[PDB]
# Entry
Amino acid sequence: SMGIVEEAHNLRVVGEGKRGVIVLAHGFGTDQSVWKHLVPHLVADYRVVLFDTMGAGPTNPDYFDFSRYATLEGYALDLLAILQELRVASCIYVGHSVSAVIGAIASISRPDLFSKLVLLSASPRYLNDVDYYGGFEQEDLDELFEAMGSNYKAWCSGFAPLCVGGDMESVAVQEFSRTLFNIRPDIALSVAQTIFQSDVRSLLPLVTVPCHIVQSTKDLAVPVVVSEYLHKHLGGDSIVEVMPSEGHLPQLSSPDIVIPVLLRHIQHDIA
# Structure
């Protein structure tokens, strides 16, 4: 229907609402299905754009250009190309995990395209640094990459429960383990490296669009102080809400708690 963007990113547009356009962008290891519980709440007031990030399970690996995605800039360029194709004057953008940062980077280039950013499970840097707590030391990354490269399937089964949190036998843990294992293992290792070694802290002052910073109180990959870091270093107005949820994909695993929070941040503007 919409062409290369639709074929390459499985782009879907639903809803017939007139308050505006909402773009939903998923994190590493999942796909647009991560939004399944949010979309029904948005279609009455909004037009909702869903897409899969290049290299996600449902995408064709033949379109994955390793040089393009060597930095997160390539993902931000993909997002700008989607927004331009869509002929959006502006949108509410909800970015999960790495897509939070991808949106923020895109918004530096084209602040006109974004009325606000909702940053769910966001971090500007996973590695600790001097006076900065991201939750990870380089040794932890080396152990992670070693598992990923030794037996990716076993890694997926062992990682899913830690990342999703809550009960191990839950539908959500099984679902994420499956979407993780849909990533071709060479793409998975490459992208994980790119993400886990990225550091966009010095870019945050350039972000001028209002940002709503939403995360789980207990999230393996995002210590709560990271929300505070974002709040103190973004270049525009921001607000933080730490949810009484566990896990890095809480819109999938605890929607009864999380969907109301996301809807409030979508609907209510900060001064």
